[PDB]
Design a protein around this ligand. Sequence first.
Ligand SMILES: O=C(NCc1cccnc1)N1CCN(C(=O)c2cccs2)CC1
Length: 119
Amino acid sequence: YDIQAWKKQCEELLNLIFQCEDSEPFRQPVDLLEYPDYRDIIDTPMDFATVRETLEAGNYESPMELCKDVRLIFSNSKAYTPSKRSRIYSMSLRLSAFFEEHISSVLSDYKSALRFHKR
Ligand SMILES: O=C(NCc1cccnc1)N1CCN(C(=O)c2cccs2)CC1
């Protein structure tokens, strides 16, 4: 029922995501010189360094907010992909599955802890 525990759990999951070769395309904000039409398609860029720095700044109030930004990395990949068979999109799908498998207990524990706090 530790309502703060999500933050270190998210730090550790980001560490695992950074060790994962599939996170390579998503570790730093997209280079617009390599993809000059990117901001014509993507309204809100997101990447794992931005998520980590937001977490470390103390600028997430909940793991739901972090989850929303991580999901935006993946929806940005889907939206930008010319093909569902793309290399970088295919890496996003595996990394998303890994992320979702690991974040589910972090969200459940947090929401349980906040319900207990409010009981
Ligand atoms: O440039 C990066 N990533 C930043 C970066 C900078 C330097 C080194 N390594 C990665 N993109 C943009 C393209 N992108 C896509 O999701 C898709 C492209 C094709 C199909 S989807 C995410 C990865």
